UniProtKB/Swiss-Prot annotation:
Disease linkage: Diets-Jongmans syndrome: An autosomal dominant disorder characterized by varying degrees of intellectual disability, developmental delay, short stature, and characteristic facial features such as a wide mouth, a pointed chin, long ears and a low columella.
Segment of the intact protein contained: 1380 to 1717 of 1761
Protein's name according to its UniProt entry: Lysine-specific demethylase 3B
Gene (name only): KDM3B
Subcellular location: Nucleus
Additional notes on this entry: Its gene is located in the 5q region of the genome which is deleted in del(5q) interstitial deletion, a frequent deletion found in myeloid leukemias and myelodysplasias, suggesting that it may be a good candidate for the del(5q) tumor suppressor gene.
Annotated signal peptide: none
Protein residues bound to Fe cation: 183, 185, 312
Organs and tissues of expression: Ubiquitous. Highly expressed in placenta, skeletal muscle, kidney, heart and liver.
Amino acid sequence: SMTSHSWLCDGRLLCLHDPSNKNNWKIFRECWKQGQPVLVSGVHKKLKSELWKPEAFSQEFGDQDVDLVNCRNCAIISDVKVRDFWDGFEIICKRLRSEDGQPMVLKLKDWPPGEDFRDMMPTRFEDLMENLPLPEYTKRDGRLNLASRLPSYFVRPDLGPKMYNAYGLITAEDRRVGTTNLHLDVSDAVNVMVYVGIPIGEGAHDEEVLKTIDEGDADEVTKERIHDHKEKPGALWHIYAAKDAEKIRELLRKVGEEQGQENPPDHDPIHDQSWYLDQTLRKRLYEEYGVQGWAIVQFLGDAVFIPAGAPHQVHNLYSCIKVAEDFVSPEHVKHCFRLT
Ligand SMILES: [Cl-]
Ligand SMILES: [Cl-]
Ligand SMILES: [Cl-]
Ligand SMILES: [Cl-]
Ligand SMILES: [Mn+2]
């Protein structure tokens, strides 16, 4: 049966099933006020699928100059063509190689650059913005988005959306690496998975993905979306409540010291965006500091809602295209205020 919603993370995460249900706000706002993330499924069924393919981005924009990041060692690959990234998105035989002769796991940095998405891709802009869930919160002029209504005493988000494009992590060693390291944002955000590319050449890579989800602490209902419904999993997230951010900073200062980093007692390991919490570190956070988070698998067409102030990290299972929009809900406006 069609149903309005269900629960993940053993009841701790709301999952809305109909992205355009006009009554979603009633269920959403109860969870959102408590500082929780929310998942909305099915957004891919609302979009023009031909606008979100890697081959179309390579054909239309392939001659632009860009920088990449090597996800395994954070090395910057400077001033290459964006087709050099797109043409290896799914075909492993076409990826840029490290010295060891292995194909690299790459992230496309700051593309489209700054606030230029709308100018560069006006048809993609319209398709996304007209189909975002919880539109009173998420549209630029929504009634419950305070972004355009606040004075300079508040940090306001840039004009969006922002595209996040990166290959999937592959090996057992890659299990400890982030696509996006642990960080927090002073605005709210909605992050939509618009394409998942499952490769070929080294295709048969299905089983290290299951051990990553299992060891990542994914709940039993989330494991059923793979095995029972054959949906395409894109990325494993860990999200922590904003109230737990200082306890996470205490753990990371202790670990940085144990690893011989030489840091002042007040430095901010979350703002530095230098850490990925692997299975060892997530268990230490729980046991030693009493902090529990949310382990979320984002499938094709899932929209993840990330509360302002909430520390979060992302680990791509397969090659992903994500598009995100920032907003300022009244529930979380305290996180962007510049005083006390
Ligand atoms: Cl809060
Ligand atoms: Cl476009
Ligand atoms: Cl709404
Ligand atoms: Cl990062
Ligand atoms: Mn973020």
